[PDB]
Amino acid sequence: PTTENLYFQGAKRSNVFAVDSQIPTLYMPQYISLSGVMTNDNQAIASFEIRDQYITALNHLVLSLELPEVKGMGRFGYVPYVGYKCINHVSISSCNGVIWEIEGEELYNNCINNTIALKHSGYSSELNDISIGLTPNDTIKEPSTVYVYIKTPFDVEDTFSSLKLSDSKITVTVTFNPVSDIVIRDSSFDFETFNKEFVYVPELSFIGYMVKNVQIKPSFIEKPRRVIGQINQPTATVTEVHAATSLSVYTKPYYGNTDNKFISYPGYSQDEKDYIDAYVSRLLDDLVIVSDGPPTGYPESAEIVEVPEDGIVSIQDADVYVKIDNVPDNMSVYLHTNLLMFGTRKNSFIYNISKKFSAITGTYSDATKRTIFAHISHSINIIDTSIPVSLWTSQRNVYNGDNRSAESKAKDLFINDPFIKGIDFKNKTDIISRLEVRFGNDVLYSENGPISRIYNELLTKSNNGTRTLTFNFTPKIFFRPTTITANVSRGKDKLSVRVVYSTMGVNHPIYYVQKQLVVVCNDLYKVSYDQGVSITKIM
Amino acid sequence: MNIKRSNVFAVDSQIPTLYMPQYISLSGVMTNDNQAIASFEIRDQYITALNHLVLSLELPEVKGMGRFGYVPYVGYKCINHVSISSCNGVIWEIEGEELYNNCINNTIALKHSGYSSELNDISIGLTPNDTIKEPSTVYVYIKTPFDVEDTFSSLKLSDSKITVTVTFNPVSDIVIRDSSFDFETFNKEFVYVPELSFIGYMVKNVQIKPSFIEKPRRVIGQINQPTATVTEVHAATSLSVYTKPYYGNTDNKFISYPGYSQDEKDYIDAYVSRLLDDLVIVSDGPPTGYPESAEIVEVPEDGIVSIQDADVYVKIDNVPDNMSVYLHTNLLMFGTRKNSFIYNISKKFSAITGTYSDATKRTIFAHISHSINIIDTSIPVSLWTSQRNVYNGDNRSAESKAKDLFINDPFIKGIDFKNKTDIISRLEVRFGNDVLYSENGPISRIYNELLTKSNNGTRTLTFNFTPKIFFRPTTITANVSRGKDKLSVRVVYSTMGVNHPIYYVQKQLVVVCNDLYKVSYDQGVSITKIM
Amino acid sequence: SIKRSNVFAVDSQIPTLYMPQYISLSGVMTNDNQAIASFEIRDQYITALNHLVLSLELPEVKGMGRFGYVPYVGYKCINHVSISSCNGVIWEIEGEELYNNCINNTIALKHSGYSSELNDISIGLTPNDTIKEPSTVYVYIKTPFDVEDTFSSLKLSDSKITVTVTFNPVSDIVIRDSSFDFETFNKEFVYVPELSFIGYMVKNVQIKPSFIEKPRRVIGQINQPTATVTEVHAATSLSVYTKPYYGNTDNKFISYPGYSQDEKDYIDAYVSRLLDDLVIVSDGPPTGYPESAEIVEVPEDGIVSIQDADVYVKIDNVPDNMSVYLHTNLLMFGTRKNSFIYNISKKFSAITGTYSDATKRTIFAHISHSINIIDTSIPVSLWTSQRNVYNGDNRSAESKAKDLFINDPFIKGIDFKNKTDIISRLEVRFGNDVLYSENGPISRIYNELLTKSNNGTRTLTFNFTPKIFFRPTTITANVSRGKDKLSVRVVYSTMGVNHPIYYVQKQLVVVCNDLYKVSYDQGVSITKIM
Ligand SMILES: CO[C@H]1/C=C/O[C@@]2(C)Oc3c(C)c(O)c4c(O)c(cc(O)c4c3[C@H]2O)NC(=O)/C(C)=C\C=C\[C@H](C)[C@H](O)[C@@H](C)[C@@H](O)[C@@H](C)[C@H](OC(C)=O)[C@@H]1C
C-alpha cells in the first residue's frame, strides 16, 4: 500500500556549487537616440554622428522609421519586414575610414532567424495586408513606427565585443532603397505622387557605455563582402581572399524584363498555402462563370465552354468537375478552359492554368449575384503564384496568354521586394543542381545535393538557410577566428563559384525568369586602436 | 579529404564536486481577508542545495449548469506572491505578475501551467450533474535566480530551514464564467491543492562562497496617477515600467471571449460573432425582444442602410417571402452629450452577407467586412450602460446579455486583452532630481524585447550587461548626500477621446526595480542590501 | 584601488590549427534479410569528425490506391546506428532513441521529411499515375560528438571508423489502403543512403581521454507493468515510457490526418470519415449498410434519442421525395449483451448542414461532438473482434475500403499523439531500495523544462554537470549490497472492458544512459611472419 520515501538512494575537485564573483570594469550603460542628416546624393542617405567624451563603447544599433499616413484611392500594402527592405546599405566609419559595413540584403539574411527583430521591422496585418482606398481622402494606411535591429559583430558577446571609441568620432551612414521596393500597389494607386511626397524619417538608437579606466585590447572582426554575377551567368568570383571565415552562395530572380506585376499577393499571411489560396481566389471569378448565355467581356482567344449535365468538362486529357448549386433557370454554368496559357510553338506542349483544376464546387447567391465557392481540388503550386504577368504574354508565347477579364487584370499588383531569392516568393524551389567552389585553380568543395544548406540550417538552427561553407568552428570573440588562408605564389587568393542550374521545359513561363548568382564572403580584419579606431585586412 | 595554441579539439575532463541530484515533492500547509497561503518547509541533513522550483496544482472537476473556462496559463494566474525565506528572513521573493513576466518567453513553462482547449475554451453545462471541466493537473515553473547557472547558482542551505510560501489569488481571478454558472457555490467548494517540487542536491564537502542576488521590488501608482516613486534605490540592476487596467468601477463583465484561441483576430472574431445575431435579423415584421431605444431599420432593395455618414451593405440569401431583413443601427452606442459625437458599434460594419437556414431558423453569416478592433472587445459592458452615457447604450437582446462573461484575469496590461495599444506617449525617469532617462517612442521596450528574446516585453532600463553568477552585477549607484537615492517615474498618457467608452477604463502605473543584495552563509542563509 | 576583470576586452587566444570539410560517402548495402548500410572512414588528413547526416533517396511511387509517408520518414527508416573501430563499438543507438534525442530539434525533424508532399495521403487513379514524386530526405544522426563542436568531436587516432546503419522494413514508414499494391512496392523498394559528416584536418592534435554516455534500451513483456535494466554501474539518466503493441490487429485504422498533425487534425479527419455514413439524405430507408445497422429517420424536432444521448440533426435544402436519416450505431462495442455499450454515434450531439442538389451530397456546416484522440487511435480489428457481442463495424463498404494501414515504429502511449497518460504511478528501484517514486509525471515536466522540449518522457537525470568539460555525475552501483540494477514498476490506469482501447496491448520501455571512458590506446606490437 505505502512506499519508501528516501532521498539519494544511489550515492582534486572543481567547485560546481560556487564561483568567485569577479568584480567587473566599472561602467554605466545608456540608451541613446539620435536624429540624422538626410541627403539625396538622388538616393536617400541618413548620417548619424556619435562624438562624446563619456561614450566609451557602443553596440545594439536600432534604426527607427516613421511610416507616414497613406491617403487616396487604390490598393496599397507594405512588403513583410518593411524596415529591413528599406535598407540598401549600412556603413560604420571613423576618422581612419570604414570600421564595418553591410549590404541591406545581408543584414536581413543575418537577422532572418531572429523572430523578434523581424516583428519589430514591420510584420502585421495593419502594414502587410493589401488595403483599399475608396475616395481621394480615404486613409489606406495609418502612420506607424518600425524598428530595424542593425545586427553588428559588436553584439556577439555584449560588452566584450562592443565597439570602442578611442577619442574618435563614429559615423553611422544608412543608404535607403527607393520607396517602390517596399510597397505593393495596383495601377489605381497614385504612386507618382506617393513617390514625390514620401520621405524617409529615421532615428538611430544604440546602447552606449560610460566606462571608467577602459583597458582596450586589439580584436578581430568579420566583414561581409557580396559579389553578384551577371544575368543568367552561373559563375561569380571573389578576388583577394586571404583570410575568410565563411562563404555563402544563393540565387536571386531578375525581373527587369517584366513590368514587375503579379496576379495575386496574400498580404500578411505568408505561408506557401496562403500564396496558393490568394492566387486560386483571384482566378476563380473568371474560371467558373454563371451567365445568361455565353459570358461577355473576355478576349476572342478565350475558350469558355458550357458545363455539361454530368459536370465534367474535358480540356484535352484533363477533366474538370464543375458543380454550382442554386443556378437560376435562365442561367448556365461556364468554364474558362484557357484562363492563362503558354506555348512556344502552335503544336508544342501548352502550360494551361485551367488544366491545374480538377474539381470546383459552390453555390450561386441570388442576393449578391455571385458564386460562393465551397471546395476546390487543384494542383496550383508556389511557382504559379510567382510568375510575373509579363511572362504570360512574352514574345516566346504563340498564344495571347492572358485570357482574364479586364476587371481581374486591373487587380494585378506591382511587387518590387529587393530581397527575393530563387524563382518563387517562398524560395521553396531549389534550382541549383550542382555547386563547385574553387580556391585559385583547385577545387575546394563540390556538391550534387544541398548538403551545405542542410549543415547551414542545422548549425545555425534556421529554416531559411543558404549553401554555406563554414571555416570557423572556434568560439567567437574569445578566440582568433579560424580561416581559409591564401597562397599568393600558388595563385590561391580568390574564391570562384560555379553552379549548374536545374532544367525545365521551355513551355513553362517560369523558365524565362532571369537569375543572378550571389556570393557572400566573410573576410577577417584586425581591429586596432593606436590613433583612433582602424581596421586592417588579415593577409 | 581534398606560437602557443589553445587546444580546441580536447579538454581535461575536470572532476566535479561529488553530488547526487533528486526530484523532491512536498505537500504544504494551507492557511487563510481569508487569502489561501501554502507553506513548504525544506530541511534535510542530506539536501545541501536546491533549484528549479515547480508548483503543481490539482484543478477539480467542475459540475453544474452554465458557461465556464479557465484563463490561459491558469497556473501562473493562481499565484499572488512567492516567498523564499530562512531563519534570518526573506532570501528571495516575487509578485505573481513578475514571475509570469519572467516566464512569458518560455513556451514550455507556459504550456505546463495550463494552456489547452480542454482548460481555456468556455465549456457549457446543460444539467446540474453535467461535467463542465474534467479534473486536471497544472505545473508552474517558479523561475528563481538559482536556475541561471544550474548547480553554480543553486540555493545553498547552511543547515538552515528554508520556507517556500505561496500566496494564492482568489479563484475568481483564474475563472471566466457567465451568470448562469453557480460561482457562489464553486467559490465556497474550491480549494487550492498545491505540491512543491524542486531539484535537491546532496553535496559531499560543499565549498560555499559569497554570492549576489537581484530581488524584484514592485511599486503600484495611485489609480490614474501618471507618477510612481521607488525609494531607497542604492544598487539597482534594472527598472521596468508598464500600465495595468483597473476594472473596480465595473462588474468585470465583457460581451465576448475567444477561449483557447488567443490571437488579436480571435478576440475580434469572437466579438463580431456575438454581435451578428442581434445586428442582422430575419423577421416576420419588425423584430421583437429589443429595448425601446433600439433603432432596427428594414434593409432596402439596394442592400444599403445609412447610419449618418456610414453605409452598411446587408444581403441575406434564402429569406422567406413572409419575412424581411432588418439591421440594428445602434446595437451599442456611447455619448457624453446629446446631438454630439456618438461611438456606435453598428457603424463599425460595412458589409454583412449570409444565408438564412429554414431548418434551424437562423442566419448563417458568410463574409463580414468591418473595422472592429481589439479595444472594442476589451470594453467592459458596464461602460456602455454607465452614468456618463446619455444613451441606453446596450440595445442587445436579453439572450445576448445573458451570454456575457466575467473576466477577472490579474495579469492584463495596457487597456486591451492583448496589450496591443501603447498608451504611454512619453516616459521620464529621474534618479533624485536629475533626469536619468527620457523617451517618446517605446525604444526601451524594443531593447527589452531584443535582449530578452520576448515578443511581450516592457519599457525596461537595464544597468547590468555583465554575465550573471560569474561576475558581481553592474548597478546604478546612489549618492545619498546629493539626494540621488530614489527612482521617480513620470508618464504622459495618450488619450482616446472622452466619447470613447475605453477612456473610462482606469489605469495603474507599475514600476518594478531590481535591487542588488549580497548572499552570505555565516550562521544560516542571509541577504544584505548593497548600499 | 580594487582589482577588476576586463569586461570590455579579451585576449584573442590562438586556437589549434585546423580546416573543416563536408565529406559525403556512399555505402555498401547488405541483406531476416534486413537492409544494412556500412560506411568506412579512413584518411591521413581527417583527424576528427562530427555532425553525421544520412541522406535517403525516396523513389517515385506509381500505381493505384492511397499512399503516404509517416511524418519524419527519415528517422522512422532507422532501426539502429552503430559507430565502431577495430577495438569494437564506440557508440550505438536504437532508431527510436535517436528520434527521441532529436524530437526537440525542429530543423532536423523538417529535414527528415515533414511536408504535405510526403505526408499527405496521395491517391493513384490509374496503374501509371504518379502517387509520390522522387525526393531526398536528410537525417541528422545526433551523437555525443556534437555537444561542444570541435572539443567533443570523434578523434580517429589513425584508425578506421565504421558507421553501420540498419534499416526498418519499408512497411513501417508507409501509410496505405488495400488498393495500393504494397506486395510489389516492398519487392521493388531499395534504401539508397549516403553519409555526410564534418571532417577536421588538424595540425599537431593533442588528444586527451574523455567520457561518453551510451544509451541502452529494455522493452518489457506484453501488458507487464514491470521492466529491469541489469548491470547498472554508472548511469547519467533513466527514461520511462510506454509503447502500444498492435500484433493482435491487422494495423488498420479508419482515418489519418496526413501532414496536419495536431490533436484536432486527427479528430477532424476521423469525424469527416464518419459523417458520410452518420447522416444520410435518402429516398426511403438507406441501402448498402449491414442488417445490424439501426438507421433511424430524423423526426420533425430534429432530435434522435440513442438511450440517454440526444442527437440534434438539421439539414437544409432536403428534396421533398427524400428524408434525413441518422445511423444510431455506426461503431459499437460491448463484451456482455446487457452491460455498457461504447457507441460512436452517441459521441455526437449536433449535426447541421445543407444538401447539394448538384453533387447529391450533404455539405456539413457545424458538428458538436465529444470525439477524442483515443477514438482516432482505435484499430479497426478491435471493433470486429471476438470479444464483441455486437457486429461492431456498421459502416458502408465504401468507408471500410478507405481504411489505412499504419505501422509507424515510434508510436508511444495508447494514442497517435501520446496524449493519454496511462501511468498512474511510477516506482524506480536501485536494487531493493526505492530510488524514486511519483504519481503524476513531474519527471516528464522536469525533462520538458530542462531540455526545452514539448514531447518529453518521464526522465530521472543524475547529471547536472556541464558536459565535455567535466566528468559526468552518475548513480553508482554497490554489487555487494545488490544495488547494480534498475527495476521499474508502473501502475497502469484502469479502463472499461466495454471500451475498445482496453484491448490495445502495452509495452513498458526503459532507457538507461551508461557512462563509458573513451581512451586512445597507443603501443608497440610484434607479429611473427607466417
Ligand atoms: C561549459 O563551458 C565552460 C567551460 C569550462 O571549461 C574550461 C576548462 O574550458 C573553458 C573554455 C574552453 C573557455 O573558452 C572559457 C572561456 O570562454 C572563459 C572562461 C572559462 O571558464 C572558460 C573555460 C574553462 O573554465 N572566458 C573568460 O575568462 C572571459 C574573458 C569571459 C567570461 C565570461 C563569462 C563568465 C562566461 O561567458 C560564462 C557565462 C560561461 O559561458 C563560462 C564560465 C562557461 O561555464 C559555464 C558553466 O557555462 C565555460 C566556458
Q: What single string gives the DSSP state of each residue in B399-466? A: HHHHT-EEE--TT--TTSTT--S--EEEEEEEETTEEEEEESS-HHHHHHHHHTT-SS--EEEE---S
Ligand 1 centre distance from Cα of residue A17 (Å): 15
Q: Which residues of A27-66 are buried (b: 16+ CB within 10 A; e: fewer)?
A: bbbbbbeeebeeeeeeebbbebebeeeebbbbbbbbbbbe
Tell me how far the alpha carbon of residue A455 is from its chain's centroid.
21
Contact A325 C358 (CB under 8 A): yes
Nearest to A516 by CA among A443, A418, A446: A418
Residues 6+ apart with CB under 8 A from C273: C254, C255, C399, C402
Closest CA to B345 of B382, B313, B379: B379
User: Which of these, A284, A335, A283, A286, lies nearest to A311 by C-alpha position?
Assistant: A335
Q: Which of B411, B437, B467 is the C-terminal boundary of a domain?
A: B411
Q: Do C468 and B197 make contact, defined as CB atoms within 8 angstroms? A: no
Please classify residue A474 by burial: count the beta carbons closer than 10 Å to its beta carbon, then call 0-12 exposed, 13-18 middle and 19+ buried. buried
Classified as helix, coil or strand, C51 is strand
**C235 grid coordinates:** 548511469
Neighbours of C324 (CB within 10 A): 22
Rounded distance, CA C431 to CA C487, Å?
A: 7
Beta bridge partners of C13: A479
In the listed set B378, B395, B411, which residue is the last one of a domain according to the structure? B411
Q: Does B420 touch chain A (CB under 8 A)?
A: no
- Spatial contact of A70 and A179, defined as CB atoms under 8 Å apart: no
Q: What is the SS3 assignment for B243?
A: strand
Phi and psi based region of residue B361 (left: phi greater than 0; alpha: psi -120 to 50; beta: remaining) = left
Same structural domain, A85 and A11: yes
The CA-to-CA distance between both ends of chain C, in Å, stands at: 77
What is the spatial distance between Cα A512 and Cα A387, in angstroms, rounded to a whole number?
10
Statement to judge: residues B404 and B417 lie in one domain: no
> Do B91 and B222 sit in the same domain of this protein?
yes
To the nearest whole angstrom, how far is the Cα of B117 from the nearest Cα of chain C? 10
Pairing of strands B349-357, B310-317: parallel
The phi-psi region of residue C277 (left if phi > 0; otherwise alpha if psi is between -120 and 50; otherwise beta) is alpha
Q: How many Å apart are CA A355 and CA A507, to the nearest integer?
A: 14
Is the Cα torsion angle B279, B283, B288, B294 positive or negative in sign?
positive
Report whether A482 contacts C18 (CB < 8 A): yes
Task: Give dist(CA C260, CA A489) in Å, integer.
Answer: 58
Contact A25 C2 (CB under 8 A): no
Cβ proximity of B284 and B361 under 8 Å: no
Contact B199, B48 (CB under 8 A): no
Residue with cell 590562438: C14
**What radius of gyration do chain C's Cα atoms show?**
28
Q: Are B356 and B282 in contact (CB under 8 A)?
A: yes
Contact call for residues A108 and A419 (beta carbons, < 8 A): yes
The three grid cell numbers given for residue A111, joined into one nine-digit string = 537577422
Named by the residue before each, gaps in chain A exceeding 2.5 A from C to N are 11, 41
| Cβ burial, residue B98 (10 Å; 0-12/13-18/19+) | buried
Residue A32 contacts by C-beta under 8 Å, 6 or more apart in sequence? A50, A55, A58, A205, A206, A207, A208
Residues of chain B in contact with residue A365, where contact means CB-CB under 8 angstroms, are 315, 317, 353, 355
Distance between CA C351 and CA C331 in Å, rounded? 17
Asked if residues A422 and A253 have their Cβ atoms less than 8 Å apart, the reply is yes
| A82/A29 same-domain check | yes
Q: Report the distance separating Cα B243 and Cα B411, nearest Å.
A: 11
* Residue C285: strand, helix, or coil: coil
A155 three-class SS: helix
Q: Provide the CB-side half-sphere exposure for A126 (13 A, CA).
A: 16
Asked whether the beta carbons of A332 and A323 are under 8 A apart, the reply is no
* Closest C-alpha to ligand 1, atom 37: B467
Task: Please tell me which of the candidates A18, A26, A29 has its beta carbon nearest to residue B208.
Answer: A18
User: Considering its fold, how many domains does chain A have in total?
Assistant: 2
Consecutive H or E run containing B195 = strand B194-203
Q: Which chain B residues are within 8 Å of A125, Cβ to Cβ?
A: 265
Residues with Cβ within 8 Å of residue A466, at least 6 apart in sequence: A109, A248, A249, A250, A453, A456
Distance in angstroms (rounded) separating the CA atoms of residues B61 and B123: 13
- How many CB atoms within 10 Å of residue B191? 11
CA–CA gap between residue B83 and residue B102 (Å, rounded) = 16
Alpha helices in C78-228 (DSSP H): 95-102, 106-111, 116-119, 182-188
Question: Phi, psi (5° rounding) for residue B105?
Answer: -90, -5
Whether residues A129 and A179 fall in one domain: yes
Sign, CA dihedral C90-C93-C98-C101, equals negative
Please classify residue C138 by burial: count the beta carbons closer than 10 Å to its beta carbon, then call 0-12 exposed, 13-18 middle and 19+ buried: buried
Same domain? C249 vs C216: no
Instruction: Please state, in angstroms and as integers, the Cα–Cα distance from residue C83 to each residue in A226, C39, C141, C192, C520, following that order.
Output: 40, 9, 11, 19, 16
Q: B202 to chain A: nearest residue by CA?
A: A8
Residues 6+ apart with CB under 8 A from C523: none
Give exposure, C481-494, as e/b (b: 16+ Cβ within 10 Å): eebbbbbbbbeeee
Q: What is the SS3 assignment for A391?
A: helix
Residue with cell 454581435: B275
B228 Cβ neighbours under 8 A, 6+ residues apart: B219, B220, B221, B488, B489, B509, B510, B511
Contact criterion met (CB below 8 Å) for B275 and B329: no
First to last CA, chain B: 62
Can you read off the three cell numbers belonging to residue A324? 454550382
Which grid cell is A137? 481622402
Report the candidate in C144, C236, C212 with the shortest Cα–Cα distance to residue C462. C236
Per the DSSP assignment, residues forming a β-bridge with C348 are: C369
Angstrom resolution of this structure: 2.5
**In this structure, are residues C367 and C273 in contact, taking their beta carbons and an 8 Å threshold?**
no
Task: Kindly report the number of other CB atoms within 10 A of residue C228's CB atom.
Answer: 14
Distance CA B430, CA A59 (A): 24
A209 contact residues in C (CB cutoff 8 A): 8
| Cβ distance of C450 and B201 shorter than 8 Å | no
Same domain, C436 and C396: no
Nearest of C528, C495, C527, C459 to residue C104 by alpha carbon: C459
* Full domain range(s) for residue B395: 245-411
Residue type, C379: P
CA B68 to chain A, closest CA, distance in angstroms equals 31
How many whole angstroms separate alpha carbon B531 and alpha carbon B479?
10
CB-CB neighbors (< 8 A) of C443 in chain B? 23
CB contact under 8 A, A480 and C433: no
Of all residues in chain A, the one with the smallest CA distance to C13 is A479
Q: Which of A19, A112, A212, A474 to mutate to test the interface with C (most CBs of C within 10 A)?
A: A474
Residue C45: DSSP 8-state:
S
Residue A264 and residue A210 share a domain: no
Cβ proximity of A65 and A252 under 8 Å:
no
Neighbours of A208 (CB within 10 A): 22
User: Do B453 and B473 share a domain, yes or no?
Assistant: yes
Q: B296 pairs with which residues across the strands?
A: B328
Within this chain, do residues B250 and B355 fall inside the same structural domain, yes or no?
A: yes
User: Residue C13, Cβ neighbours under 10 Å: how many?
Assistant: 14
Q: How many CA atoms lie within 13 A of B469 on its CB side?
A: 16
Q: Quick one: how far is CA C70 from the chain centroid?
A: 9
What single-letter amino acid sits at A150?
A: I
- Cell of residue A528, nine digits: 586596432
Q: Which residues line ligand 1 (CB under 6 A)?
A: A 475, 478; B 11, 149, 152, 467, 470; C 10, 466, 469
C13 Cβ neighbours under 8 A, 6+ residues apart: A478, A479, A480, B6
Contact predicate C139/C37, CB 8 Å: no
Q: How far apart are CA A200 and CA A405, in angstroms?
A: 38
Asked whether residue B293 falls in the same domain as residue B238, the answer is no
The method of structure determination was X-ray
**Surface-to-core class of residue C82, CB atoms within 10 Å of its CB (0-12 exposed, 13-18 middle, 19+ buried):** middle
Angstrom distances, CA of residue C120 to CA of C184, C253, C378? 21, 16, 20
Closest in B44, B202, B471 to A11, CB measured: B202
DSSP symbols for C344-385:
GGGGEEEEEEEEETTTTEEEEEEEEE---HHHHT--HHHHT-
Task: Compute how many other C-beta atoms are within 10 angstroms of the C-beta atom of residue A461.
Answer: 12
Grid cell locating A101: 559595413
What's the per-residue H, E or C state across B96-138? HHHHHHHHCCCHHHHHHCCCCHHHHCCEEECCCCCEEECCEEE
CA of B152 to the centre of ligand 1 (A): 13
Torsion of CA A9, A12, A18, A23, to 10 degrees: -170
CA dihedral C413, C418, C422, C424 (to 10 degrees): 130
For residue B470, report the distance from its CA to the centre of ligand 1, in Å: 9
Q: How far is CA C444 from CA B142, B250, C98, C366, in A?
A: 16, 42, 18, 37
How many whole angstroms separate alpha carbon C292 and alpha carbon C332?
10
Q: Are residues C465 and C382 in the same domain?
A: no
Chain C residues close to B109, C-beta within 8 Å: 449
Q: How far is residue B20's CA from residue C355's CA, in Å, rounded to a whole number?
A: 67
CA separation for the pair C284, C297 (Å, rounded): 9
Contact assessment for residue C85 and residue C159, using Cβ atoms and an 8 Å cutoff = yes
Q: How far apart are CA C318 and CA C381, in angstroms?
A: 36
Residue with the three cell numbers 444599403: B304
Strand partners, B405: B254
Which residues sit opposite A305 in a β-bridge?
Answer: A335
Does A159 contact B at CB distance below 8 Å? yes
The amino acid sitting at B15 is I
Q: Given C410, C430, C462, which residue is the final one in a domain? A: C410
As a three-state string, the secondary structure of C217-229 is: EEECCCCCCEEEE
Integer Cα distance of C160 and C154 in angstroms: 12
Q: Are C121 and C258 in contact (CB under 8 A)?
A: yes
| Grid cell listed for B491 | 508618464
Give φ, ψ of A511 to 5 degrees: -55, -30
Rounded to whole angstroms, how far apart are CA atoms B411 and B173? 9
